[model samples]
Target chain A: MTKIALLSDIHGNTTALEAVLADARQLGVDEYWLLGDILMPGTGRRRILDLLDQLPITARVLGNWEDSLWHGVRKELDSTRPSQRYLLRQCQYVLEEISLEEIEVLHNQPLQIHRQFGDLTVGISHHLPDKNWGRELIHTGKQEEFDRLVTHPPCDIAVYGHIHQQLLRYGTGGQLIVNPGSIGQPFFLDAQLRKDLRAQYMILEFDDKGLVDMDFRRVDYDVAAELQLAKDLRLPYFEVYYESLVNGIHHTHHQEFL
Target chain B: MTKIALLSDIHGNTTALEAVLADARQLGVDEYWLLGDILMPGTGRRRILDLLDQLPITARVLGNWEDSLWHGVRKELDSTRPSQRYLLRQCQYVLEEISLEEIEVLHNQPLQIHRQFGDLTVGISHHLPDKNWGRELIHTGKQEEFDRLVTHPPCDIAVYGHIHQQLLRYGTGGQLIVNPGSIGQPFFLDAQLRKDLRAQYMILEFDDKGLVDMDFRRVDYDVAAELQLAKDLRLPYFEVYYESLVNGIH
Candidate 1:
């Protein structure tokens, strides 16, 4: 059987990412597929990339955070809106932290990648087939919504990341759809499920018979240490970041502090 | 330095328990502290007890499930109620599966265990100091309620498992309070947190500097396979177990 690790939404928390990577390696994963949203919100940009660069990455997809950074650099925004200015500043910080070579590498990442193993074809993307990210492709969306993703540029298995919730569903065309969840920042709509702060990922197993199993794995890490790093960096929106780290929920009350 | 693996709430899910043990061995754990709840709900009493017998167990504390079984056997239970009959039948099943020697082993487990490594004193229990399990000592209970646990614990660290939520806090007495969480079945108020269906445990590093670090570890396993085993055995409460296993939420 072939074992592959699928990771995504590693929002700059290198501590969790490293722990997940270590656990996956111990399990003897053959390759890695990075679904995107590599670095943002937290302060481990260069180091996160440094770690990923050492891995045997089979493919990479573009995430919305990276796309937002690209848009911030290319488009002009009004300075009056605090959110826009805050984003612009975040983009600037990321650009300053990342090397030119790394930026070029990110630019080279495609929105989707396709691979074939035996009779099974797997499609990997950040979100749907064409878009890198959006709310329309959430985990709880209608079945038809998910079917649309697998129907276009059809494949036997469609995998994505962005929902931050691990999911497995079968499309109308009898194709498999999977969301590996988030590596660094995982969230759930259910309030009772928010206390777990473990890093999330998935392992895909395939053999001659085709896709055999998709295993979801969660690994615990030093969350307090990760939060301390964010504080030490004096990152923008520090309180919001701290709350999100501690509670595993994105705080909407950051504008007042900003 | 002394390295110990603290386990609790094994609840007859041998698959998860074995996964946690394997992961702990790879980390070079020197000893094991079992907080309680070894076998119940699912059908792995013999296998689970056999596995524990082979481990380097430093201390053992009684859990609520064991207490329930003991109560069921000794006291006259009302056979009219489904819940009561269920308990009686389950207790009988467990009694038949385990050996008389194993029953004596459970009979001898203490309510709490205490030890000293250098200047650091540690306390292990299935729940609070006075009880094996109860809602009075829940994870999100008041600070004063937790303070009472370590106030007279007379130890530098108080470790427990029952609520099945991994926690680290310090009592007003300046002693550390830790909960390694659950080994087999872990439930939480947060739906997302409960979806983390990995076997939960903790590694405690002790040295002259006192408790150095407490690392929480989660190991993944095949829950579907476990559910299938439950079904194959025709275990009671199959639907509840199936939902918990498939959803990774208890």
Candidate 2:
């Protein structure tokens, strides 16, 4: 039997990441699988690297943040767009903490990874195999959007981590699908859910019989202290990030901070 | 203007320490004053040192835990006592993570430190001037127990961190005395107070006029994760530590 803790989208909140990681360690899993996003717009760089490097992670993939970070650095982003403007500003802060070589390392990683456990195979990605970010497989995604994952690798189960929400469902073809959600930046539709402010991740159990059990876990951390971390680290887009954190709202598209 | 953050008794919970330290950094303090106890029975070692080392700490005093840690290692502790046995067992695990040199450095520190801000003198210690561990000032004590702190060095104000309780009182001579409480282990007589498992420390504001005000803060951290940290770090005496954490009984 193989017990794996699937993780993704840390998004630079090391305090939250620490809580989630500590909880995962206490649960005692066989291995860890990292999906994406471990830098920028917050106050974590080397510590995040140290934390993950000390762990037993088998697979790692790049998220859209790394791609956009590169695009912003290479002057490919549309500066006039509010979201890209935010990205452009965040890129500078990230570079101050992470070197260009490190960004290249993240940018150069595979977008998807597949692991086989006997007759069972599991597919993992930041988003789709083709793109790290898009609206195609959002929480409100269409059925075809969900099927893209199943068809891409032809696996018994599909796992990814970009939407920042815990998900456990089946595709129309009866293939299993899962998400560990966001370790740093999480999104939600319900007011109660947004108010939670807990870090998110998941654990999956597999054996010769394939996946036996799965647990969707949400770990609590100090949100105010993390916000203070951004301040101490002088993260870019401070006000928007502050507002975004206080109410758990998404404001990357808003340019008022700039 | 000198703003100081007075802290103590972190035990081995760096998770709680980080939360408190970050909050202090956000509030903007001039320097940090470490009162005592940074190891054992829990899981923080080099990280706690890093967290404190990177900051501006003007004063550092040795705690009873360090004293007993050395005592347990030197075989000076009475092996029959359960409290000492708890201390004895914790010392073994504490030694596993902390080096002998580090322990010696901690042991070599002064038992008390006194800082002068112009005309005002503030005294700091892990417990008392003579002995770091004693029942003389156990939250409930006689007038003489409290007066020893004031008259020992004839200071205008007193500060210490051994009882694991936040205190603000005066001696018989009306000298001001204060304690920032425990950053890791806290004891509460009230059921409701014990339920509030927040890490504690305090910030003191000093201006040209000397000694302005102080705010006692209790910063919250993920206690469950801290327990997990102990488990992950393989801290010794897990069961008692686990039970002590759930209800914040210390």
Candidate 3:
């Protein structure tokens, strides 16, 4: 069996990243496919980039967070709203923290990745194969909503991770849709109404019969530790980071906390 | 069918706890069972306590970390070795960060829990039933070794989480041994043959047939963020924490 470790939406939690790598290693994975959202909103951007450089990754796709860092920087240089400026500056903060080489890694990554292992052709992206960010390709939406994802997707098997949820769905055209979910941030709500803070990822195994099995894994890391670091660094949207960390839900308004 | 979220070795990672709860919610779980090691070696003990208070936790069993905190505090107060004293003082640091109420929660927790759901009788503990800390029931040992855990466990369905690795094995008495693994600090080996840092946890689902299924989950958290926080706060044993976070084999 060809085992591939599927990771996405890390959002800069090195502890979680390290744990996932270890777990993946134990499984003896053959390849690593990162779907995006590598850094930002956490204090470990430089460290994460350094670590990723050492890994033997097969491919990577740009998630909205990666795009936002680049776009947010440009927007920050010309934006006017105080709240927007604050958000933009946070993006700028990420930009300032990493080396040019690290930023270029983000810039150089393709919007989508296409590769083949025998008959199984895999297509990867942050969101939909075509659109990096939009409401059209949400995981919760109806089948009609995935029309673009199914009909015009980049590859036979569409792999993405922007919804922060692990999913295995089939497109109308019979293409497979796989999401490894969010590594650093995962959204879960229990009947007790409490949030889940476990880091989430997935492993996919392919063989001659095609995609055979998938394991949706959740690893726990120090959420409080990550939040404490964000607070210590006084990172922008620190409270939001706390809310996101402790509650598994991102804030609706950054300015409200400000 | 009933669902239970089995959490252990939290080690005060509020971030991991939050994510586990969220994941359990989506699974539509009925109960939350904590397997111990709630606090220490991390900076979010108080926050985790407050968060747990808001949730519907059905049961709890004290882990080695809790035992160590209580034991280390007494040891620190009397130790003469500088290294031992320094390590023990970090336990004191944990004591100071949490409130009396939180400490009381730990103090009141049982070393093991016995609960009944449907036809299944579940037993929960941090390690062996009699002792909370030891290498008596590690993951790598033979199944015959688990005979002690299975034959004379606290409950028919024995559950624990100290080895930091998920396990499902049967005892000589036809008893089941389940471990949810460590939530905060899971030691894993990477390609470099070093320990890779990841958070680990488990979910258990029970039906009319008794314990039905379980998911041993491994998730990625930011180790760099955690290591930096330890350094920034000047937390004791920062180097050790750093090594554990990066190498994963630790």
Candidate 4:
């Protein structure tokens, strides 16, 4: 029986991540799996790296945050102007501290899928997969979504964390498609559902028979400390990021103040 | 030295108020001063009111919530039409459960002042007392919009609960004006001294030497529970209130 504390979408919020980890330790999970979005636009990188670096049975992955970083690096590499060259060279100084080992960790994240016992398959991505049991299932209106899950992704269980919504859609024969939701930042809908205004994650437990018992857990941490840190660090963008976590806002169009 | 767990403006977060009381009990406080507003707009009102009913060595005060209940009751008395009358009667059913003994606790709350010791005086009010300190210090500034509390009032320390901002503003001769702010629904100030959307409170220590020190505690309770209750009860203008707490807008 593998009791795994599978966590994902920890977009910083090391405090909350730590709290969930503490809970997991009490549960005595056999292994820990970090799906992705370890650090995304905050001082969380250092704290998260510190935690993950020390953990023994941790399998890590990268989400859209890793992709975003590479995109910026690519832009800098393609700069034509001499001033751009100077800026890019200067940027290297900041980027260099990320450590090749850390980047390798981010780079080697599983892009496609995972199978716990080559039967209980789990899909991994920052967004939903391009094919079966993918993004289309989001808010697919209960009956239709359930039907889709039962028909398509024939695996015993499918788990992901892109939408930040904790979902466990059961189909015909103990089959489930689950989104662990988010660790650091969660969608407003899930926040409202759990009756909490903090970050949430999912705990997936598989019995010796490979029967899965999944539960979404909402974790509360020091939000004020995060806000205070943002204020002190003068990280204007990070301040917005932290506030977004508090509000569970999805103001994608235009955000003057996040 | 007598230590009191002075609670105020608990806008119905029983879990948090209980936690505070638990913490206070661990510290061996002499009494608990519940400064009203237990129910008006949040979760676990009945639980908190019942807890307060059972707890010993405590003095309670009537905040605006109590006043609102009375105002609602009196308004019901004036209706003449049968349909309107019957609807008004429903308030009785709702009001009947809490018992007058619980509500009467609000009435017994001292409006004036309490003597902490021989020389130390502590005054408690729902809002600032205009008569005692109104003329001396208006709690104002040059902009003229802000309310200025200039004086410490007649007591050695005036403990109020309205402003929801904890502070110890000392005047000449060590006179102090203090607000425990609110336990549940406190409006916190941001880095700009602008009000942030959070709650705050205060703790006052009194010994034979008079006022010793004050502690300002900003408790992070369940904001989500409060918001959900507001929507669940269909309370007046709660969405706006909840938004104000989250956005730092108010």
Give the per-residue lDDT digits (tens) of candidate 3, residues B72-134. Answer: 755534558765676576677686777555565686678867888665567777887777887
User: Which structure is stronger by DockQ: 2 or 3?
Assistant: 3
The better candidate by TM-score, 1 or 2, is 1
Error of 2 at B25 (Å): 46
Query: Chain A TM-score, candidate 4?
Result: 0.75
Interface RMSD of each: 15.5, 25.3, 15.9, 25.1
User: What are the lDDT scores of the predictions, listed in order?
Assistant: 0.73, 0.75, 0.67, 0.53
DockQ of 4: 0.01
Q: Pick the winner on DockQ between candidates 1 and 4.
A: 1
Cα lDDT tens digits for candidate 1, A1-258: 688999898888778898999998999999999998887777787889889988999878988777666666655655777666776766677777886566667766788889888766788888877877567666335557767666678776788888776654456554557777788887654332454557878888776544444566667778888878877777777776677666766743332211
Runs in model 3 deviating more than 4 A are A75-83, A189-194, A255-258, B1-250
Worst 10 contiguous positions by lDDT, candidate 2 chain B: B187-196
lDDT of 4 by residue, B1-250 (tens): 6666678777665555766676666767777776666664444546776777666645555676665555555564555765445434434533645565665665455544454554655666655443221222222212111122223345555566654444433333333455566676654332222223334555555554343335444444566776676577554445555665555344
Q: Is 3 or 4 the stronger prediction by DockQ? A: 3
Per-residue lDDT of candidate 1, residues B107-170 (tens digit): 6778877988876667778887778877866743655666666657566678888887665555
* lDDT of candidate model 1 versus the reference: 0.73
Q: Candidate 3 at B148: error in angstroms?
A: 45
Q: What TM-score should be assigned to candidate 2?
A: 0.50
Q: What is the docking quality class of candidate 4?
A: incorrect
lDDT of 4 by residue, A1-258 (tens): 576666777766666678777777787777777766666544465667777766654455556555544543556344554433433433343254466556556756665455555234554444443332234445333344444433444444556565565554334343445566677776543221222445666566654333334444555677777777666745435535655666656443212111
- Cα RMSD over interface residues, candidate 1: 15.5
